[PDB]
Amino acid sequence: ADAKALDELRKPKFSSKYLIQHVSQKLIPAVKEWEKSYQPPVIHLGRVLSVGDGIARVYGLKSVQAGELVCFDSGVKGMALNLQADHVGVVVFGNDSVIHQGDLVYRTGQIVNVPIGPGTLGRVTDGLGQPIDGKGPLTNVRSSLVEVKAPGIIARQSVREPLFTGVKAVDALVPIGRGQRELIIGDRQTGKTAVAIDAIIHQKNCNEQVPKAQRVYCVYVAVGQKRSTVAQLVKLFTQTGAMRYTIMVSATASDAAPLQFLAPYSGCAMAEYFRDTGKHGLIIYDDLSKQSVAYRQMSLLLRRPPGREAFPGDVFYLHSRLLERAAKLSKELGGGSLTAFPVIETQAGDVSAYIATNVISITDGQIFLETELFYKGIRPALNVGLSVSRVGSAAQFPGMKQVAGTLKLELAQYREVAAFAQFGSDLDAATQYVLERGARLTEMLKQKQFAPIPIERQTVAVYAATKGFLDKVRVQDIVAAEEAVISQVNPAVFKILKANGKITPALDAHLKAELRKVKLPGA
Amino acid sequence: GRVLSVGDGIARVYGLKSVQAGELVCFDSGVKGMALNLQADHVGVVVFGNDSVIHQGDLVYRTGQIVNVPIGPGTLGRVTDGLGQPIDGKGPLTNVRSSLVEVKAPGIIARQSVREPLFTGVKAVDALVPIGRGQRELIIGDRQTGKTAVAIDAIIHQKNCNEQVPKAQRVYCVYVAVGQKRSTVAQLVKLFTQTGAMRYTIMVSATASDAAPLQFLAPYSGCAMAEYFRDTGKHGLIIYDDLSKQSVAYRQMSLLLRRPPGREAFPGDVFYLHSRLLERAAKLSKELGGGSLTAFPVIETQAGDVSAYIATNVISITDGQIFLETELFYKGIRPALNVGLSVSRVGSAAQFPGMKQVAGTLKLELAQYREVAAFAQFGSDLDAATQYVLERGARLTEMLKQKQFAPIPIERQTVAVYAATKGFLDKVRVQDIVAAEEAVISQVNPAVFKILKANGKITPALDAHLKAELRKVKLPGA
Amino acid sequence: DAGYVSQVIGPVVDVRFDGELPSILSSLEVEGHSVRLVLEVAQHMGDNTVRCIAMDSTDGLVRGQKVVDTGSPIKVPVGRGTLGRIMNVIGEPVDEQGPIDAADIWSIHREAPEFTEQSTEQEILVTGIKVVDLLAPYQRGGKIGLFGGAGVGKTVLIMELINNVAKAHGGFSVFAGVGERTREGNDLYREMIESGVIKLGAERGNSKCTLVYGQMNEPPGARARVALTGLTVAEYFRDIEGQDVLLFVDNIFRFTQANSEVSALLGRIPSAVGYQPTLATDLGGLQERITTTTKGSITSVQAVYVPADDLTDPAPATTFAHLDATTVLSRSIAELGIYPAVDPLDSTSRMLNPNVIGAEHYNVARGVQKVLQDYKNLQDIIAILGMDELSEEDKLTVARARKIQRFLSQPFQVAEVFTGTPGKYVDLADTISGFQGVLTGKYDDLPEMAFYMVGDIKEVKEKADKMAKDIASRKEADNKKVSEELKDIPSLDKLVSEIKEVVIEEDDGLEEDFKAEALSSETVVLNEEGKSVPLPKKN
């Protein structure tokens, strides 16, 4: 059984020829009798051994690379994922009902690539590049690999530019930066998509205002969502004019699991064009908790051994190599940027889950949206103690930086007394004074949906709350009092607060002056 | 035999036709291995070292002999690895003898009742969970709660009392360090030489960079080295520090040999592993010599979760349990022995008879103090049958505190516990904690210690003089 | 002579050798790749096949691609030529400044030092952090672990320890970034340019740190070995240069996680929670190489991420045993705004011994832990009663412990860019005496928040003075404040006039550089000859 006699067997030791001479003049006549049942032999092409559940096992394909787009003879694409010794495991980019046993698989030569460029700006795309909005094919566009490595230590520079989202809980408490990956984590129906949408709408509102290179180009990656929701989102974006800067990659729920797995990489390759060419990108991987389930489906059907919650071993790498592409580049590489908003859904608030802890470990900040604050009127349901941000200062508005530290610490004082408000002792007009002051601040931080606020109106409206001008107002109607503050105040203080960037003492005087002239409705 | 596959410290060896289960083999590279699972096509050999020197097709020779360590009096004072070879660098082990590491535990008839006491020098352990010779007592706790402290104080106290007993009743200790760092083993050898404890202490050390079979096999090496002293009518004391690491090394080997896993991926025979180890600690019969071996397994819990797999297994195996809490540890109670959860199934049959008549009050009023434990934090004083037990239990928990690496003789713990259970307490304001805890044992004359040690019991002729001596204690700092 | 690629499943490649199998841990080179693809041999599969882990991505590997053997493990440049450089796992420079001019390249795999060459010297390493230096004092030449969940401040604490120790050390430093963010790798590189710890150009040799980076974007074969590369640079400085080295490892958890990521593809059935069955021995084989021998001294600070704040997860619970000191950062302390969020109870050190740091230091440390544990036990009856029936001793042990909780916080010099307060280095004696004062009761006459984010005990006393002049103020409210207009204030329409003008041309910069190639409407594939041929008309 040991190999040395087994390769000594390749020496001829037949010691008779009454079969070698007989079979040789009998074999080729016998292959002719059944050559109709012989499929033609394959070396460099493929032939499907087995197909099932979206995994083809392909014999042949001698020179395919790992991770390469292969194409079946029925036109449906694939990707050579695990290259076994005897076959190739191809994940099928589409419905595997058109693939049979014995179909030819054609190697396309290229690693998986999507159309990138300025012609993608405004289109609705599936997880591979094909436009699904029916507005023709993509023009003014070139191909690019979906699996580039992230820009290294020398290609990057410090995250300094602010990237307002228009949600003032975010722009005051957990401020994003321009090359920052900020996680939107929460339970279902808490407003994660809503925070991402207000980010994209606010970037449309600010792109029509800045000189040509501070403009942020958005990409929405919609993994696993239903096709109706993507239709609602495209309708909203096109009725607000935000679809001019937005690409939408849409690998919906009926799509094959490799398209949902690959659509964050397709969307990141589309948004990396703006990072690599000196512009500024922004990407939302909405339901990144569904890309991991599609990857788990692919890896369990390729018979890779499961792990925690039957996820693969390399499901941390799946998201780390995706999110690390969101960077702020150096001036020697254009100064471009790409800021990511991955969305992770928890189950019953269990943030201790597997994919949740992986993406929390990768991304810079968190935007925790808790379902118990969503039903107390706090919308966006931002848990202030649990939502962190890595950049902190140096990447937000300077005028908001003057007025937001005294909000962040004062809400810590307000949460400090909530576990001591069930008895009613009301110690020495301190634990009862901040019990209304912080309650007025949390009412200041509420806002509506699909209506982002410019940053100067937010840093006026939170100037009006952490300073005076609002303590004589009931907690019930500060959401009403803020429109009195925003509208009735002269709209020329907003321009000079936007153009300065901070609250100068020349402007602090007029801002405290015009915050006393308006009518607050509280009675 | 020929190596088929090698990787992660497991060599699949084709050949080795008549090899025994658990037998040593030897490779071409000079590394050894133990043939663990013998299959019809190959032998699964775990490798005693780094497997990077083994290639496919390397030759494996069987050594013909099961794994064995040198035992004997030449191992005393030497730091060995998990296979017996000395790593302290003082040359080969003179005056030893090879003997198998997997022996059978002594049966029902070879046992004797565990009656003579093994003093640890920790007065909490000697007063509340008393250890006999031949007992398996689990030192269980969380991380950094003082388990190695209790083990080390038992070893150091065995050195201290080994100088004042005859040749027969001396305890020779073995400390087995499984899975520990190599820098913290050297600090223990430093402490044991500076203490003088290495005159009776063997030190078996399978560190973290050792192979998994060496850490799996080091407790059996240490148990064979201490079974030398058990089987020749002398007394031993074996301490397996982190038996929870020996189980993890065994889990690694059994998973890489593809044995079917059970709860928390442990193999099915991990209870058999630990009970096969811990049933060898026995008090032998009068016919086999009368010797004894006392085991202190150490199991680390995670969040006090003693319902974990290995912790439940060893709690099932051992007689007693010394449960060290982390909340008592930072509250100042060090050694942080949880009194209500620490058991000893041998119990009062194997403690000091002078302590047995004083500690029976102590554990009772400690239990009374534990049930009235919320009232300590109150302003409204209750009916002074609870405030009495509150101040009494507080001074009793402060009685059982003890500094590290300073064990106490049993006659001094008896006197200090007598001075707190009979009512000679510091019922003053407690500014004088500095000059009253040690003042009892330092100001009574040492003749009462000689009488209490030699008689082993507070006689009516001695509690009279002890009560007369306890009243004249000075504390002249006030 | 050479081998060929037999199988590629993600980051694990099977390579088949017709004779001359490599050793385990051998590095192999894949000839013909886009980049330098290094495979490190992990095991011998058995029919003349080895199984390897890739140091780069395996996308592009063809079966039968020629793989050549180097006869040795991954050898990296070590020595003075690496000071002030950034290296890969495999020793490539990633800082765009020439090659690395280091002599006597070393294998990244070696055995740990022996038991005979172990040092037992215990000198305290003064960090300037008053919660570290009081309750869990570090050892110079010791293994230090900064445990903590995500976002509790392990990286800011390791940056403050760099700023406080590595600049004033004399010896060399090695930061080994293991599976971390590339953003903070760049931030570390830039602020060690600005500190002088890394100098570029002609005075490169005056640098004091070698960066070795293996971040999150790298495949799991690279994150599982970059700690060995940083450890090899530190072991050269310890063994050959005879130096005192300072190894800083950011998330040694990523070493075990990256070994776990390839563990099932190497064919091992998983252990408990989901880690490899070789978790303890992999972690031990790394951690035992970080020792001070008799030759030189490696002081290691390791950040250890605990997953989901769970200190009983086996990857932190295994690395607990390898550490002399332990700084458990917790989320609960950080939710009170107290930074560094060091759990004063759950932190432990081997130096916290009255024979080591002195009984005067030991007793104030144990007293702080005693009053903090008593307050931790009293909080549960406070929240039910309300802290007015606490016997005037438990109103004192609450007030002193609540002063101590604030007094353990400290401004950090590297954390003034997102907090604003400049950082205070606190000496050891001014920590011990300052905590002895609040313990015995000299400072009950100061308010409670005066102890928050200060330095010495001389700063809480003057923060109380500033707080009580400021709560003495804000009593005038009538006029001649900033709100009046003829003070210095121009008109509001005048301030709109000084706004400089920026243009908007409404073409947003998309018609200037793009090479718009014409993409194929048809699928174009390769036939058996490899010729690019459109997809044949037959389904």
Ligand SMILES: Nc1ncnc2c1ncn2[C@@H]1O[C@H](COP(=O)(O)OP(=O)(O)OP(=O)(O)O)[C@@H](O)[C@H]1O
């Ligand atoms: N700021 C807000 N004010 C009021 N309502 C809001 C706000 N944000 C979101 N909502 C409402 O909350 C609901 C959930 O919002 P959204 O779909 O963004 O959450 P989600 O977490 O993405 O949900 P899913 O997980 O189902 O996608 C929506 O119906 C929306 O109308």
Ligand SMILES: Nc1ncnc2c1ncn2[C@@H]1O[C@H](COP(=O)(O)OP(=O)(O)OP(=O)(O)O)[C@@H](O)[C@H]1O
């Ligand atoms: N009785 C005591 N008095 C004072 N200090 C003590 C006492 N017991 C333990 N300590 C201290 O507690 C620290 C941890 O103790 P020890 O190592 O004994 O616990 P452990 O449970 O073995 O920890 P690990 O599991 O990490 O080895 C040591 O530094 C020791 O000095």
Ligand SMILES: Nc1ncnc2c1ncn2[C@@H]1O[C@H](COP(=O)(O)OP(=O)(O)O)[C@@H](O)[C@H]1O
């Ligand atoms: N000393 C400190 N002072 C103020 N904030 C801090 C401090 N340490 C940490 N933080 C806050 O914690 C957050 C994360 O810290 P970091 O070191 O990145 O933790 P991790 O290493 O666990 O990711 C930062 O946003 C920072 O604002």
Ligand SMILES: [Mg+2]
């Ligand atoms: Mg959603």
Ligand SMILES: [Mg+2]
């Ligand atoms: Mg221990």
Ligand SMILES: [Mg+2]
């Ligand atoms: Mg970090």
